[PDB]
Structures are given as C-alpha cells and as structure tokens.
Amino acid sequence: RETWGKKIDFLLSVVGFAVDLANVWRFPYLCYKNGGGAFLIPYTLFLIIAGMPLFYMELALGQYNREGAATVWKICPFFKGVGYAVILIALYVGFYYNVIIAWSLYYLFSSFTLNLPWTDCGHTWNSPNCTDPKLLNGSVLGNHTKYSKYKFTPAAEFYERGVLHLHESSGIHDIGLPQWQLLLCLMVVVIVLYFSLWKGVKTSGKVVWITATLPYFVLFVLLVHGVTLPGASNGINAYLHIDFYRLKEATVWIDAATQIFFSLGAGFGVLIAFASYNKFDNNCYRDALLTSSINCITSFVSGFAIFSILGYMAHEHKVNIEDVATEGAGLVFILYPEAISTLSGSTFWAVVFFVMLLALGLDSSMGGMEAVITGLADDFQVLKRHRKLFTFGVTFSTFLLALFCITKGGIYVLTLLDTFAAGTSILFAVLMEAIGVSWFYGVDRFSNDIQQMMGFRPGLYWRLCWKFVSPAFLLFVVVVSIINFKPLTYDDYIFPPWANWVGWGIALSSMVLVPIYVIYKFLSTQGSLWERLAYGITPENEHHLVAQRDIRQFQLQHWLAI
C-alpha cells in the first residue's frame, strides 16, 4: 500500500487534519440553533469521553489492519456490513457537501467586484422587502420589521434569492429545475475533484498545504474584527451564558455528537482509510490528543466569532440575536460576508475567505471520496486497477444525485440529508463499531495490537471508554434520537410528514446494512449453527481455530476482560 509523505506526516501537519468544512460551516449554525454556550458543554463532554476514544480506536484499527472502511472488519466478518454503512454515509455526505463548495464557488464569482452584491439592496434578486441598515434615511420598511429569522437582510436576500433562488419554490415538493449557475459551479467542483483523486492517494500537495495556515489566519482576522464591532459584546455575553434548560433537552446532545463525528471524521470511514496508508510506528495517541485539542479550540473560537458577528448584526438591524439570522446550513454565508464588508478592502478579504472555504470544502470532500474508493477497492480488487473509471463513475453518480440540492428548493433536500443521512445512522454505525471492537473482538487484543504498533498499552481510561463509556453513551444518544425525534423544520418552512418518512427511510437504508449483512454471512456459510457463528465471530486468519473448537468469544473470560 501507499504511504503518506513526510510533508503531511509532520508533527505540525496535524493542524491541517484538525480543520474541516464542518468546523467552519456546520459548527456555527449548530451552536446558534442550540442557543450557544449550552452547546459547548455537551460538545466537550462527547469529545473527551466519546469522540477522542473512538478517534484513537479507528486510527489504531486502520493502522493495524491496513484495510479500507469495510474490509477492516476482517477480524469479525459479521460487522463488515457496518463498514459499507459508513461508506454509504460518506457518500450521502458528498451528495450535499459538494453542493456547498459550489455555493462558495459562486461567491467567488461574486467576489471579483468593487461593490459586493450582499452589501446593499437594489439588485434584480432583491425583493421589495429588502431593508439595508445604511438606508434608514429612506425607511422603506425600517431596520426592524419582524423577528422570526429576518431573511430581509441584503446578505440573506443574495443567498436565498440570488444564489439558491428559494423564492421560486414553496417546498420540497416543487423544487423545480436546477439553476444553471449552480449547475456549472458543481460541474467545476466535480471536475476539480476527479483530477484530485484519479491517480490515487496524494501524499502531499498545495491543497493540504494552504488548508493549514489560511483557515487559522481567516479565523484570527474575523475574531480581531468582531471584538471591535458595535453590539459584538452582546453576542459574546449570549455565547458565554449556559442555559441549563437546553441541557435538559435531548436535541443538544444529538447535535453535539453529530458535530463531533463530522469534525473528527468518525463514522464515515475516513479515519480508517487514512490510517491504512500510515507507518507502523505512527503514534495515533499523540495525533488523537492534538486533533481533539485543536478541534476544540477551533470550535470555541469559531463560535465566539460567530456570536460576535451575530451581535454586531443585531445591533445594526435593531433585532434580537435569536431572530437576527437563520438557523440553517446557510448561516455562515450571511454572517461572514457582512463581516467582511465592514473591513477595509472588502474585496480582497472576501476573495481570500472564499478561496479558503472552497479549499477546505475540496479537501473535506476529497478525503471522503478517497475513503469510499479505498474501502470499495479493498473490497473489490478490480477497482485497484480501474481506479480511473471507478472514480469517474463515483463522481458522476454524486453529481447526478446532488443535482437535487442545486435546485430552487434544494436547500430543503440538503437539510434533510444533513439531518437524516448522517444523523442517527452514523450514531448506530459507530455504536456497532465500538461493540464489534471492544466486545466481539475484545479490548485485550486491541491493546496488544496498540502495544506492538506504538510500544505501549492504552491506560485504564481508554479501555473503559472503548468498552463501557462510549458504547453506553452512543446507545443513549441513539435512544434519545429515536424516541424523542423532533419533526424537521427549516427557518420558517415546515417539512411535511412524508419528508420525515423519506429521511427516516434514507437513514434506515444505511442502518439495516448491518443486519442484512449478518443474514448474508449466515446463509453463505456452510455448516451447522455452531460453525456458522464461529466463522462469523472469528478473524479470517484464525478460522482454523473453528476446526479445533477453540473460540475465545464462546468463553466468559473474553466478555469479562475489561
């Protein structure tokens, strides 16, 4: 197998893997929806007890097995159907992650102008209900009209109408035809993606070089700008005020878990595919610690900047912080452009920011496509030779199925995918992974593999998390997601029940791949129930132990190792 170059394997190169479109695009609106401040505690908790242990586990498993997402379950076949699951999950993510890049690409085409289109009203897409904060002298409708989401701001008008053209659709039932601008943007995105995958894993490149310094620089500039804005202090106070009533709810914990899994990459097969090309002496412990710490710091500073910009916009518009902006996937494309417009030389900063989030999106999607391709090629060796045609077909299918999110009402389908395709499905997938690694495979064998790879055994904390803490918390979040499910709703649009049923069906498409595979493995195995179960719960390299009637899983000492 291939090996990552020394440029990407450097000690200071973990910062590149510690930022993602999720940390800059998903975290902001996920924290704003949960109030802010009350979301950091569940986020940090799931990071320290669930996110980082699963991160370390997936890294060690991918480094030891040298396999893809699904084939890494060569130690326990009954669980190979869960690998496919996360693979599909990753694919589902692409079905809308690439649509996001296209958005930024359009913003890039909107960034090479002296007057930014989101600065003021008066354009073609601007509706009569467009109130610019600097045009209070005219008072067409006033800076403050109503407080539900305030979608009448120039940035919101440019995003919903000038980019997505949501005004030409009333729901998910009448999305219509895809916009040709977004069509060309997604075409360029998938073209750049194809020629960035087709020759296998890229050990090092400009993509992984610019995503390590540009995101941090942009975030620092945005923080320095926001801390000196009028009204920004109010947003800071709203971000450092923890409402424990929100903690009493279950949605906050689900959002925190999903954001942790998106930022760290657990539950998509990216970590295993990445570790499959690492060295045998790579210290996954230090990598996991640094990744978790940098991700937590980045999320904290990003939420702080987002709330500062929200307070600034609330002061400029004379609206409440909870109703000044939306709570959808387009929150950053409304807060960040207006913040850049206030800085001196808005054109240059906007261009830099759009190049940055476009690069971050491309690296995030590449990683996902490479994980999917690596898994399917380790499953089918024909792909290891037909890489070019396989990547072409994967990108073409992703483009075809993403044509839905570049439609006039495509934001609804994008929210549906971001809520159901990678919602309870990824939680069930990582729960099955933890159960198959800590209970079926056993924590002792995993600790021995870690000791023979990195030279030390994990402490009691890591093993107790892998075996007891993380599986229990994953089961708990799955239960509170299934029982306490809330109907999916947009800023003001309410999804019909059939949309929720379609979302649940999409989630079950990935969820039931674990049971379906156990059935397939049981029927395809020749022998009695004992032999079938033994072949299903034992590694492929120890199937001879089935003949010797010596199975560790059939002993009480295996399940009580701890």
Ligand X SMILES: CCCCCCCCCC(=O)O[C@H](COC(=O)CCCCCCCC)COP(=O)(O)OC[C@@H](O)CO
487 binds ligand CLR (CB under 6 A): no
- What mask, x for binding ligand X by CB under 6 A, covers residues 380 to 419? x---------------------------------------
498 binds ligand CLR (CB under 6 A): yes
- Residue 470 annotated as part of some ligand binding site: no
- Residue with smaller CB distance to ligand X, 80 or 315: 80
- Residue with smaller CB distance to ligand CLR, 235 or 536: 536
Q: Which stretch binds ligand X (CB under 6 A): 131-139, 187-195, 490-498, 509-517?
A: 509-517
- Residue 16 annotated as part of some ligand binding site: yes
Task: Give, in order, the Cα–Cα distances in Å from 111 to each of 277, 313, 349, 405.
Answer: 38, 21, 9, 23
Burial class of residue 555 in the structure, from the number of CB atoms within 10 Å of its CB (0-12 exposed, 13-18 middle, 19+ buried): exposed
* Among its own copies, ligand A1D5S, ligand X, none, partner that 80 touches (CB below 5 to 8 angstroms by kind): ligand X
Which phi and psi (to 5°) does residue 204 adopt?
-155, 145
- Residue with smaller CB distance to ligand X, 334 or 369: 369
- Residue with smaller CB distance to its own copies, 386 or 457: 386
Measured CA to CA, the distance from residue 501 to residue 373 in angstroms comes to 30
10 binds its own copies (CB under 8 A): no
Measured CA to CA, the distance from residue 230 to residue 207 in angstroms comes to 36
Which phi and psi (to 5°) does residue 435 adopt?
-65, -40
* Among ligand CLR, its own copies, ligand A1D5S, none, partner that 175 touches (CB below 5 to 8 angstroms by kind): ligand CLR
Which member of 509, 545, 553, 558 binds ligand X (CB under 6 A)? 509
Q: How far is the CB of 206 from ligand A1D5S (least distance, A)?
A: 12
Let me know: does 155 contact 338? Beta carbons within 8 Å: yes
Measured CA to CA, the distance from residue 129 to residue 514 in angstroms comes to 50
* Among ligand CLR, its own copies, ligand A1D5S, none, partner that 367 touches (CB below 5 to 8 angstroms by kind): ligand A1D5S
Secondary element (H or E) of residue 363:
helix 346-379
Measured CA to CA, the distance from residue 288 to residue 372 in angstroms comes to 22
Give the CB-nearest residue to ligand A1D5S: 368
Breaks following residues of the chain (C-to-N distance > 2.5 Å): none
Measured CA to CA, the distance from residue 498 to residue 496 in angstroms comes to 5
Q: How far is the CB of 268 from ligand CLR (least distance, A)?
A: 16
Sorted by sequence, the CB contacts under 8 Å of residue 557 that are 6+ apart come out as none
498 binds its own copies (CB under 8 A): yes
Q: How far is the CB of 245 from ligand X (least distance, A)?
A: 39
- DSSP-based three-state secondary structure for 489: strand
Q: Identify the DSSP state of 129.
A: -
- Residue 263 annotated as part of some ligand binding site: yes
Measured CA to CA, the distance from residue 373 to residue 132 in angstroms comes to 47
Which member of 125, 300, 392, 559 binds ligand CLR (CB under 6 A)? 392
- Residue 481 annotated as part of some ligand binding site: no
- Residue with smaller CB distance to ligand CLR, 3 or 524: 524
177 binds its own copies (CB under 8 A): yes
- Residue 150 annotated as part of some ligand binding site: no
Which residue type is seen at 542? E
Neighbour tally for 318: CB within 10 Å: 14
Residue linked to tokens 């890294």: 59
Q: Dihedral sign, CA of 298, 188, 201, 392?
A: positive
- Residue with smaller CB distance to ligand A1D5S, 4 or 239: 4
Rounded (10°) CA dihedral 365, 368, 374, 380: -100
Helices 513-524 and 80-109 meet at what angle, rounded to 10?
Answer: 140
Where residue 338 falls (left for φ over 0; alpha for ψ -120 to 50; beta otherwise) is alpha
Let me know: does 339 contact 309? Beta carbons within 8 Å: yes
Structure tokens at 501: 């049923």
- What mask, x for binding its own copies by CB under 8 A, covers residues 155 to 174? ------------------xx
Structure tokens at 221: 């500039």
Q: Which stretch binds ligand X (CB under 6 A): 227-235, 308-316, 468-476, 514-522?
A: 514-522
Which member of 39, 43, 55, 84 binds ligand X (CB under 6 A)? 84
- Residue with smaller CB distance to its own copies, 498 or 530: 498
Q: How far is the CB of 433 from ligand X (least distance, A)?
A: 16
Q: Which stretch binds ligand CLR (CB under 6 A): 23-31, 62-70, 144-152, 396-404?
A: 396-404
Neighbour tally for 306: CB within 10 Å: 27
Structure tokens at 71: 């084939």
Minimal CA–CA distance to 304: which of 222, 425, 248?
A: 222
Q: How far is the CB of 497 from its own copies (least distance, A)?
A: 10
Structure tokens at 453: 């790879």
490 binds ligand X (CB under 6 A): no
Q: Which stretch binds ligand CLR (CB under 6 A): 175-183, 204-212, 246-254, 453-461?
A: 175-183
11 binds ligand CLR (CB under 6 A): no
3-state helix, strand, coil in the chain (%, to 5): 70, 0, 30
Using CB under 8 A as the criterion, which residues of the chain lie in contact with its own copies when the complex forms? Answer: 173-174, 177, 498
User: Residue positions in the annotated binding site?
Assistant: 16, 18-20, 23, 32-33, 90, 94, 262-263, 295, 327, 363-364
Question: Binding site for Na(+): what residues are annotated?
Answer: 16, 18-19, 23, 263, 295, 363-364
Return residues touching ligand A1D5S (CB under 6 A). 8, 13, 16-17, 20, 22, 90, 93-94, 97, 208, 262, 265, 268, 270, 273-274, 363-368, 370-371
Q: Which residues bind ligand X (CB under 6 A)?
A: 80, 84, 379-380, 509, 516-517, 520
